[PDB]
Amino acid sequence: MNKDIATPIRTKEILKKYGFSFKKSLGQNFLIDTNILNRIVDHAEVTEKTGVIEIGPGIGALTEQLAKRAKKVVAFEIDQRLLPILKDTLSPYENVTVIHQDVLKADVKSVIEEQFQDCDEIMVVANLPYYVTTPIIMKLLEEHLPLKGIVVMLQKEVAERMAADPSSKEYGSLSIAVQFYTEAKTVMIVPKTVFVPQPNVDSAVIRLILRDGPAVDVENESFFFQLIKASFAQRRKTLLNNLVNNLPEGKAQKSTIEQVLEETNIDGKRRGESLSIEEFAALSNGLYKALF
């Protein structure tokens, strides 16, 4: 409780024992609020059922809280300087494995196979480094990993885009990408005062529950995502305009794109940002057949 890593004094004591200096280049902002940490663990429903992938353990503030509930925790940490610290701070916990490696170069599926054979369910729970929040989430989702869900702390503005409702000004290609694979919900907003050092931007905790199969039925995922990106490329322009200018087929096959919009009952004159994920799926299947 009060003796845990994540108290302001305890955190400082550790950092001082090792003379640790933060690297803003690695998004190092450590949690020093045990109620926040416990809250995150609650939102991830971590029990003895659960094997947990943690990204960016730091000096172990969240790791410790996860370790008390989970069957097993594996934590990827990029900073070699933290490794001896974690060995010390997490010495009371025998269910923790730290792997020294940038999560973006890891083969997470192999790690899951090797480490979590005895777990009923796998969660990702993490206070993410803000400089690569979106790459990390995209990697985890793109690779169809056998996860129940992902609960992470990240920039507020990023959570808001991930979880965006279609009426939200934050609705975008990122909303669609996340919501294709998951049900997304921003569950907490956290002040800057619960970290050391305090971050420059606001923070939030988002909860992503992996869907049993994709949200919509599309012929071709690759094509679907490129279409999404082309459609949102300029906020104020028509969907047609965006497609002509952003699909490489756009300026070669414009008439075919106009025919498909007509055939799928989607007014080109609407903005791309008006389209729901279902309309995007319909448009994508129609275009994929025509385009190819």
Would you tell me which residues interact with ligand SAM (CB under 6 A)?
26-31, 55-58, 61-62, 76-79, 102-104, 127, 129, 132
Which residue in the shown chain puts its C-beta closest to ligand SAM?
A: 56
Is 247 within 8 Å of 230 (Cβ atoms)?
yes
Between CA 225 and CA 172 the distance in angstroms is 12
Between CA 249 and CA 153 the distance in angstroms is 39
Is 200 within 8 Å of 29 (Cβ atoms)?
no
Query: Least distance (Å) from ligand SAM to the CB of residue 59?
Result: 7
Between CA 197 and CA 231 the distance in angstroms is 39
Query: Least distance (Å) from ligand SAM to the CB of residue 106?
Result: 8
Query: Least distance (Å) from ligand SAM to the CB of residue 196?
Result: 9
Ligand-binding site membership of 31 (annotated): yes
Q: What is the DSSP letter of 213?
A: S
Query: Least distance (Å) from ligand SAM to the CB of residue 102?
Result: 4
Nearer to ligand SAM, 102 or 170 (CB): 102
Ligand-binding site membership of 60 (annotated): no
**Residue 237: C-alpha distances to residues 69, 91, 98, 281 (Å):** 50, 57, 48, 20
Nearer to ligand SAM, 37 or 184 (CB): 37
Ligand-binding site membership of 291 (annotated): no
Nearer to ligand SAM, 104 or 215 (CB): 104
Ligand-binding site membership of 142 (annotated): no
Ligand-binding site membership of 241 (annotated): no
Is 227 within 8 Å of 266 (Cβ atoms)?
no
Query: Least distance (Å) from ligand SAM to the CB of residue 72?
Result: 17
- Torsion, Cα 204 81 53 208, to 10 degrees, reads 20
Q: Which two tokens stand for residue 110?
A: 């192999």
For 145, the 3-state DSSP assignment is coil
Peptide bond into 191 cis (omega under 30): no
Radius of gyration of the chain (CA): 22
Between CA 141 and CA 133 the distance in angstroms is 13
Nearer to ligand SAM, 31 or 228 (CB): 31
Query: Least distance (Å) from ligand SAM to the CB of residue 41?
Result: 12
Ligand-binding site membership of 243 (annotated): no
Nearer to ligand SAM, 30 or 224 (CB): 30
Nearer to ligand SAM, 102 or 121 (CB): 102
Binding residues for S-adenosyl-L-methionine: 29, 31, 56, 77, 102, 127
Which residues are documented as binding site?
29, 31, 56, 77, 102, 127
